[PDB]
């Protein structure tokens, strides 16, 4: 109900020393008090990417263990991630995922990320070759709530379609893409605008054709989503990503794996064996599959890359997200918006976990 | 000796209107004077980066053709830039510019930019693969005085011995590498701050290795060469990289050869043919050789990509190129500097240029 002498950290307000009250899931109060600070307190974390985590995958719609894992990293939102699949596996998935927010009306469980299979099969990376498709007219009828975000990309045949989709409360994403500059700017004059795992899965930017690559590092209200692994981009890309589009820019995302948080062993993604060596997983031919990052080590690395302020810290960990989804009152340490909190060492390590009011999570 | 009435604009003192006195080849007087402007008053253009320019060649050492066409252009001070070439071109080069401004005394030739043979062969660009090669002990006695500027390949073997050639009143400028953003720093930390027309004969930038590229847009006091022709770097390209260094990273240069101003046709740059296609000159391949861009049409192609101020157009055309140069009495409209001016009407079309209170050119 009450969460006193921290160090209060909220994307627009700034960070202060205070006291936050909560009142059946919502926040009535928040006073700033000078005195001297308990721990850190910032809005709930939210991964719109992730697989799975710890053996639990989307593809077998393990939303109950994925849910109660991801307590312990902070995230209180999440959507849980397909990859290039069936028309059926789909359906299937969106249809449990509906059941199970049905059951839990509490849940961390947004919906679901359909990554694929409407994507570019020269930069499938780790997609199942034989499930990626142009969309459809009958497939297009097949997705809708709980489908929450969607990766495609621009260029492949009838991904117009697709732009029906945002009625309906789906975010659009270009991602695995070798569309061009201008390709992908037919669908940002639409009001698509984010890209997904910023910059794997797309053509490199030349000095002529800047493609998505240079759309995403160009353009100022088009948000990048960032693996911050040290591995899917080094510490120096990320240094100049965050140069380039500030706080303001950036979604922080794990597109983690089942096989995180687990012995170096060997399983796969959908329909595809991937082996996994010092937490780095990658396909036999050494494509990377994913990652092995716990959304906590996402904040600590992106925070020690670039040197940023735990107040932009708030933005590309919850806030960029919240405001893509539309989610108003979520992301904020403010009044009249939802309980969704994070309390951390200084060190940012996960202590504590607040969805909707009650605690879920103590480490 | 006195220009009045004009929008004068000052790097640093920003714009203003008024008047300014001349004496003796030196700006005595700068007076802030209220009134409508007369035309546009900036400093004397300065292109560090230029080989050749209708039917005057570098090579050629046609040092007095260049310098008369340049003043139309209201370029005040350039380089004469040589290609990959052998020591003993090399030496002559030197020896006929060291003779041109020995005896033409208040010159725009600032002297010789060496841009090669100390360059990577993946990187070549328009370059003879024959000249390349690395630099040594012996080699590099040979370069001082008029050199002023020398583009080399950080990677290359033996490179570090060119950190000598700084103390001899040389700048030394990264290009037409495959070097890694590290090779790259180890220059950097040795006063390195310059990349040679960024960022075409550069390794793209890369998730993990941002390379050269990459380096020169996340160091802040990195300045980069633009050739805004609109070939070399696309509009959109141009407002990336002001978008990322702004007006203080940018230095405007033209990389114009022989052909600039002629009929399109086939010519030569160095030992190698070249063809021009609506005044795009390449190679045999397709790979671009150089440019026939006009200072002046270089100047109004980077405001209209990017928008910027008049007061950064100057810093961009001009001062930027003279911090680098060390020319410290050129590159303002301030009492005490060299009268080095253009005066362009307000559609920025050069109607006037003065070097060294002497006017040498009027439309
Ligand atoms: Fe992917
Ligand atoms: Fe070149």
Do not use: W
């Not at 059951?103 to 919906?111: F, K, R, V």
């Amino acid at each position: 109900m009450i969460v006193e002498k921290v160090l209060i950290v909220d994307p627009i307000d700034g960070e202060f020393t205070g006291d936050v009250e909560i009142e059946e899931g919502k926040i009535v109060k928040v006073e700033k008090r000078e005195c001297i600070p308990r721990g850190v307190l910032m809005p709930g974390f939210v991964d719109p990417h992730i697989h799975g985590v710890v053996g639990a995958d989307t593809m077998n719609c393990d939303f109950s263990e994925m849910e109660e894992f991801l307590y312990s990293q902070g995230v209180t939102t999440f959507l849980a991630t397909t990859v290039s699949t069936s028309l059926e596996k789909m359906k299937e998935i969106l249809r449990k995922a509906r059941d199970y927010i049905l059951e839990n009306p509490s849940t961390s469980l947004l919906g679901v990320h359909l990554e694929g299979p409407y994507i570019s099969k020269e930069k499938k990376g780790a997609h199942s070759e034989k499930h990626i498709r142009p969309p459809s007219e009958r497939e297009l009828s097949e997705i809708d709530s709980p489908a929450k975000m969607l990766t495609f990309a621009p260029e492949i045949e009838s991904s117009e379609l697709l732009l029906r989709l945002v009625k309906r409360d789906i975010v659009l994403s270009a991602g695995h893409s070798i569309a061009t500059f201008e390709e992908f700017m037919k669908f940002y004059k639409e009001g698509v605008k984010r890209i997904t795992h910023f910059p794997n899965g797309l053509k490199p930017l030349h000095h002529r054709e800047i493609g998505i690559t240079g759309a995403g590092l160009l353009l100022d209200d088009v948000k990048l989503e960032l693996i911050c692994d040290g591995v899917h981009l080094s510490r120096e890309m990320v240094k100049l990503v965050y140069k380039v589009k500030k706080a303001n820019g950036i979604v922080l995302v794990t597109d983690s794996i089942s096989a995180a948080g687990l012995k170096d062993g060997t399983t796969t993604l959908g329909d595809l064996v991937v082996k996994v060596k010092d937490g780095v997983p990658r396909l036999e031919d050494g494509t990377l599959a994913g990652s092995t990052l716990f959304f906590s080590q996402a904040v600590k690395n992106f925070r020690k890359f670039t040197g940023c302020s735990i107040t932009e810290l708030a933005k590309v960990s919850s806030y960029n997200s919240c405001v893509e989804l539309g989610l108003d009152d979520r992301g904020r340490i403010a009044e009249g918006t939802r309980a969704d909190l994070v309390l951390l060492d200084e060190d940012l390590n996960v202590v504590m976990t607040i969805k909707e009011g009650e605690v879920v999570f103590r480490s």
